[PDB]
C-alpha cells in the first residue's frame, strides 16, 4: 500500500483539491489528516472542518477509514464524526482516490442524503424544515468550525 499512498500524496501536489488539503499527520504514511472548507453554497460556509484518514494495510483493496474530528450538524454525519457515504463502504473502488473521497464529502455537505441518515432527527429537520436545518447548521459552524 505504501507506493500507492505516496503516488496519491504527490498527485494532490500537482493538482491540489480546492478548499481541501491532506497529508500525513507525522511520519506515518498510513495516517493522514485533512481539512475541508465549508462549501460556499452550503450552510457550513466559513467553517474549517478537520478529518482523519487511516489507510488499511490492504489499501487500496479496502477503503480508507475517514471520520470528522470537527463537530458538524449533518444527517449523514454523527456526533462521533462517523460518515455514512457509499464510496467509503459498498461503493469503494481501488480505482478511486482520496481526492475523490474528499470531493465526494464536499458534495455530501452541499447535498445531504436524508432518506438514508446517520442521525434521524437531523434528517427529519432537513426534510420537513429546511430553514431550521440551515439555521442550526450555521450555528454549529460558528460554534465549532471557526
Amino acid at each position: 500500500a505504501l507506493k500507492r499512498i505516496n503516488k496519491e500524496l504527490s498527485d494532490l501536489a500537482r493538482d491540489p483539491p480546492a478548499q481541501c488539503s491532506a497529508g500525513p499527520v507525522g511520519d506515518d504514511m498510513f495516517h493522514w489528516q485533512a481539512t475541508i472548507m465549508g462549501p460556499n453554497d452550503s450552510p457550513y460556509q466559513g467553517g474549517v472542518f478537520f478529518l482523519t484518514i487511516h489507510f488499511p494495510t490492504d489499501y487500496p483493496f479496502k477503503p480508507p477509514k475517514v471520520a470528522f474530528t470537527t463537530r458538524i450538524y449533518h444527517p449523514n454525519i454523527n456526533s462521533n464524526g462517523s460518515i455514512s457515504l457509499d464510496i467509503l463502504r459498498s461503493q469503494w473502488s481501488p480505482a478511486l482516490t482520496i481526492s475523490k473521497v474528499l470531493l465526494s464529502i464536499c458534495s455530501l455537505l452541499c447535498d445531504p442524503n436524508p432518506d438514508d441518515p446517520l442521525v434521524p432527527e437531523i434528517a427529519r429537520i432537513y426534510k420537513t424544515d429546511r430553514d431550521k436545518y440551515n439555521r442550526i447548521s450555521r450555528e454549529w459552524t460558528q460554534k465549532y468550525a471557526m
Partner: protein
C-alpha cells in the same frame, strides 16, 4: 393506556396506547409525534428488542412503562 418512550437525547415521549396495540402501531404513533419513520426506529424493553408484529401485552408492557428508542441503521 399511557406509556413513555425515552430517546437518546434524553427527551421523554408520552404516548397513548392500548395493550393490544402492536409494536408496529406504537412506532407509527412515535412517527406522529416525532416525525421519525418506523424504518429508523428501534425499541427496547425488558432486555428485548421489540418485534413489529407483536403486541404490547405480548411483552407484558403496562401503564407507565418506559420504552427505549434507539437507532436502526440500514448502514448508510
Amino acid at each position: 393506556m399511557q406509556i413513555f418512550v425515552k430517546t437518546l437525547t434524553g427527551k421523554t415521549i408520552t404516548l397513548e396506547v392500548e395493550p393490544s396495540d402492536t409494536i408496529e402501531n406504537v412506532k407509527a404513533k412515535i412517527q406522529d409525534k416525532e416525525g421519525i419513520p418506523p424504518d429508523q426506529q428501534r425499541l427496547i424493553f425488558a432486555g428485548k428488542q421489540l418485534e413489529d408484529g407483536r403486541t404490547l401485552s405480548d411483552y407484558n408492557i403496562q401503564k407507565e412503562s418506559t420504552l427505549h428508542l434507539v437507532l436502526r441503521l440500514r448502514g448508510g
